């Protein structure tokens, strides 16, 4: 089997991407944030504290003939940005782009933090990291991808995120029309439960490539590119007026600037992030100070190849027995 679903930016800054997902019988379609940095499929629901729902579409398990309470199971998750959610668990039929999994754990939110409430466009998350990170207790549950894997034509999914445009998540096949040149594959460590890999270095603009190992995670659920302070300093040093602002929470730069591209290495291959992708616009409405899309990972504990990086590539998440990651230009 295979599946193919369009993913769409939630706003004009590509802050996140939503993908329609069918849950239950008859189908309830919710727009979920596919997150290769976590491993819970959770949704706003008929159980979510009413004051914490503001425009989201909710899953109502009592209206699904295939929903079953997973007795005794609860979940609770905290994300890198400090947001969180928790609740109880149903199993139900879940379909993405024509690919159907029966008995998928669908984690129903009883509580969500303010950042989720305030984002009316995101009805929940669909985790695509390794199932070892799943938070369901006392019996950990499998991700949609892990459940689907045995049925897939090939044990892979691909992320093709757009810059200010729709893109695609495919399951079970590699669309050879969706990228240019070749796909370069690189080793993955699952020791931390993430799609963790090592970039071979970077360049700033038309500068020379610096060969250096940068361990990080491929994370579709993170907006920006978070890299070591040395790398980030080298980038912003090429932008007149750029500075790190503790009051704003990162690098800012004059909105009048032209930003250089940023290149990252994948083996001997190179992925180029255009400068435009790195401009996240005014720090506040009407400001002439703009927020950078490359930020230091120093306060995080891990480097993160978020959407800023991933949307410059066609990315293969290979979930074979020995997992790997593939990157191609597009
Ligand atoms: Br390769």
Give me the count of residues in the chain.
330
The span from the CA of 240 to the CA of 243, in Å, is 9
Both structure tokens of 270: 């190179």
Q: Does residue 224 contact residue 306 with C-beta atoms inside 8 Å?
A: yes
The span from the CA of 44 to the CA of 301, in Å, is 30
- Closest of 56, 4, 13 to residue 165, by C-alpha: 13
CA of 313 to the centre of ligand 1 (A): 15
Mapped onto helix, strand or coil, the DSSP state of residue 106 is strand
CA of 325 to the centre of ligand 1 (A): 9
Q: Does residue 174 contact residue 154 with C-beta atoms inside 8 Å?
A: yes
Q: How are beta strands 99-112 and 184-187 bridged, if at all?
A: unpaired
The residues near 105 (Cβ < 8 Å, ≥ 6 apart) are: 41, 70, 73, 89, 90, 91, 134, 136, 141, 142
Cβ count within 10 A of residue 298: 13
Going along the chain from its start, the domains and CATH numbers come out as 5-174 (2.40.70.10), 175-330 (2.40.70.10)
CA of 327 to the centre of ligand 1 (A): 9
Q: How are beta strands 250-254 and 314-318 bridged, if at all?
A: unpaired
Both structure tokens of 71: 């007795």
The DSSP symbol for 147 reads H
Contacts 24+ apart (CB under 8 A), 13-17: 13/280, 13/281, 14/161, 14/162, 14/163, 14/164, 14/223, 14/307, 14/311, 15/223, 16/119, 16/121, 16/122, 16/221, 16/223, 16/307, 17/161, 17/167, 17/220, 17/307
CA of 198 to the centre of ligand 1 (A): 14
Neighbouring-strand partners of residue 240: none
CA of 186 to the centre of ligand 1 (A): 7
The reported resolution of this PDB entry, expressed in Å, is 1.3
Burial 261-278 (b: 16+ CB within 10 A, else e): bbbbbbeebbbebebebb
- Residue 291's φ and ψ, nearest 5 degrees, are -95, 135
CA of 157 to the centre of ligand 1 (A): 17
- Residues involved in catalysis: 35, 199
The span from the CA of 50 to the CA of 47, in Å, is 8
């Amino acid at each position: 089997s295979t599946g193919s679903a369009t993913t769409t930016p939630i706003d004009s800054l590509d802050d996140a991407y939503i993908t329609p997902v069918q849950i239950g019988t008859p189908a309830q379609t919710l727009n979920l944030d596919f997150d290769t940095g976590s491993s819970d499929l959770w949704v706003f629901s008929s159980e979510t504290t009413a004051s914490e729902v503001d425009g989201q579409t909710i899953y109502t398990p009592s209206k699904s003939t295939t929903a079953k309470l997973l007795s005794g199971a609860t979940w609770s998750i905290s994300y890198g940005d400090g947001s969180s959610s928790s609740g109880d668990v149903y199993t139900d039929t879940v379909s993405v782009g024509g690919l159907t999994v029966t008995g998928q754990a669908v984690e129903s939110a009883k509580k969500v933090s303010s950042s989720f409430t305030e984002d009316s466009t995101i009805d929940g998350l669909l985790g695509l990291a390794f199932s070892t990170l799943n938070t369901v207790s006392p019996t950990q549950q499998k991700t949609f991808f892990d459940n689907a894997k045995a049925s897939l034509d090939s044990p892979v999914f691909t992320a093709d995120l757009g810059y200010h445009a729709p893109g695609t998540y495919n399951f079970g096949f590699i669309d050879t029309t969706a990228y240019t040149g070749s796909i370069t594959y690189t080793a993955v460590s699952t020791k931390q439960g993430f799609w963790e890999w090592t970039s071979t270095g970077y360049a700033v603009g038309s500068g020379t490539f610096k060969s250096t190992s940068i361990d990080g995670i491929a994370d579709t659920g993170t907006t920006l590119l978070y890299l070591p302070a040395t790398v980030v300093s080298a980038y912003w040093a090429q932008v007149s007026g750029a500075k790190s602002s503790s009051s704003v929470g990162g690098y800012v730069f004059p909105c009048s600037a032209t930003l250089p591209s940023f290149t990252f290495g994948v083996g001997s291959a190179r992925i180029v992030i255009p400068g435009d992708y790195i401009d996240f616009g005014p720090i506040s409405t009407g400001s002439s100070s703009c927020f950078g899309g490359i930020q230091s990972s120093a306060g995080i504990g891990i480097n993160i190849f978020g959407d800023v990086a991933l949307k410059a590539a066609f990315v293969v998440f290979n979930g074979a027995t020995t997992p790997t990651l593939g990157f191609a230009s597009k």
